[PDB]
Amino acid sequence: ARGPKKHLKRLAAPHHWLLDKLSGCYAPRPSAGPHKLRESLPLIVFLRNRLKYALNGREVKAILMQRHVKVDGKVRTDTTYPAGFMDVITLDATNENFRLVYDVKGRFAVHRITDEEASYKLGKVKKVQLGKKGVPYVVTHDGRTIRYPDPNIKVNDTVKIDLASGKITDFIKFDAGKLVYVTGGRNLGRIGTIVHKERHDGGFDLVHIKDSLDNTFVTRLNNVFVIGEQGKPYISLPKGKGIKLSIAEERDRRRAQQGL
């Protein structure tokens, strides 16, 4: 329609932001940025809707223009900045550091982390190819170009990133036995060990994933994200740890809390 769209209607928003239907008509349209639109969480959502610090979209700007909040160690003044998976939101006041990571329902958790952990983030490597003057580089899932990587690093490997420097500290090869975070689909937010990979040339590779309670499931390779070795998560995981209980089993765990 003549050129790019600047609005987003509240119903056409991502469901996983959990915006109320009545209060509004539009919803905050993510600016262009590191993450894809439907996979992001605008800061205005994070501040106002999720943490309950701001009450309006004016107050979100009041907070952003003080230059408190910083995403991956750099200050941002954009209400609709597209923060996404593995990003570190650091507030100076409070001294709360959070990492955006999916709970099991497939929604961004309020996952508070220690100040040590906030030094780094993981990065799924998307493409690895040779740049100008023969200099090799990798491309992470948040679109960071990193030049001069370890030649062991191939596509689909995760890569630990220093943030301050923005350099590869360490990496994890994609193989059988590695822990995984599923970052899309029905099984968004589940955690589990890789079992084997199905090939399918000129198609979509699939990844069988066991979990701690011995429930297998398959996803597309595009939705998988390596996060460690077996029982050795590089980041801190949220409460649950990507388990997926039945609606029955969930309802039983409410009746423990119901006692009070």
Partner: protein, 185 residues
């Protein structure tokens, strides 16, 4: 360009409108429970129908099925909570065999009458709309209100209004004034 606000019809009119056997049996219920309209009866027939439809659709499915186990127990507990379904019957089969009067017996209007308080269903409707009776803390002025079995003890006259306490009304405060000024000079 807002979101649509949803809404729903809460009742269903009967198919054939001058069936004499029905019309008699309806007025039996409007008398016993003191209901304004046939619409109040139709409301409860419609709520029963959705329940029975829900239970039939589960009994088609096998025992030891997730959706049956989950929603079956949820339907049962939801009825047991409001005291429509008794504590003995919790099979699912028993929720099907469940009459219209088994809902009527748990609404405020009748539950006021049955706990003393009024002396008639026709009085209870008045008391409720006149804002006298109150559930635990707050006033309820809706006779339709289904009492939830953990609230039946807590029904009493309000902290506001006469009977319970407070000022002695509007008519008394005029009728006290007229006798007082007549006696005095």
């Amino acid at each position: 360009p807002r979101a649509p606000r949803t809404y729903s019809k809460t009742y269903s009119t009967p198919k054939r409108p001058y069936e004499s056997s029905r019309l008699d049996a309806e007025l039996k219920l409007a008398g016993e429970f003191g209901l304004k309209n046939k619409k109040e009866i139709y409301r409860i027939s419609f709520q029963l129908s959705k329940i029975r439809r829900a239970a039939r659709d589960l009994l088609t499915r096998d025992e030891k099925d997730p959706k049956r186990l989950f929603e079956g127990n949820a339907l049962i507990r939801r009825l047991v909570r409001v005291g429509v379904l008794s504590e003995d019957k919790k099979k699912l089969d028993y929720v099907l065999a469940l009459k219209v009067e088994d809902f009527l017996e748990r609404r405020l209007q009748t539950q006021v009458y049955k706990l003393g308080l009024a002396k008639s269903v026709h009085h209870a409707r008045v008391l409720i709309t006149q804002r006298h009776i109150a559930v635990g803390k707050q006033i309820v002025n809706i006779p339709s209100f289904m009492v939830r079995l953990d609230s039946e003890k807590h029904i009493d006259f309000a902290p506001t209004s006469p009977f319970g306490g407070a000022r002695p009304g509007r008519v008394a405060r005029r009728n006290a004034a007229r006798k007082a000024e007549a006696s005095g000079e």
